Amino acid sequence: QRHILNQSDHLRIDYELTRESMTKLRLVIFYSNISSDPITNFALLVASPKGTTLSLQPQSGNMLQSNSRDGIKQIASVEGISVNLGKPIKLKWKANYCTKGDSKEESGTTSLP
């Protein structure tokens, strides 16, 4: 059920991926703080994948307490031909946040399963 978008030294990003229609996937993204210091000012940015409309809802909050599992949730959907076909859809994403006297960034492009 939970797939791992990304796992750094501080933050795990994972998600539930259901299929809601023949053209639409629904992602329920979860953010986990796996470190001993709080994370603040968290935000995910995302690009529309190549053959698809991306719909992003606002996240539950922008703060994760130390060792907080799923302290923020954010719903996205992906809709279009690629999902209808079995075409691999790539999410280009970037996160920014603050922890440990530091302003951090994390980025990638992950092929959704």
Q: Where are the domains of the chain?
A: 1-113
Cα(107)–Cα(85) distance, integer angstroms: 27
Q: What is the resolution in angstroms?
A: 2.3
Q: Encoding tokens for residue 82?
A: 């690629």
Backbone angles phi, psi at 31, to 5 degrees: -115, 125
Q: Which fold has domain 1-113?
A: Immunoglobulin-like (2.60.40)
Cα(29)–Cα(67) distance, integer angstroms: 17
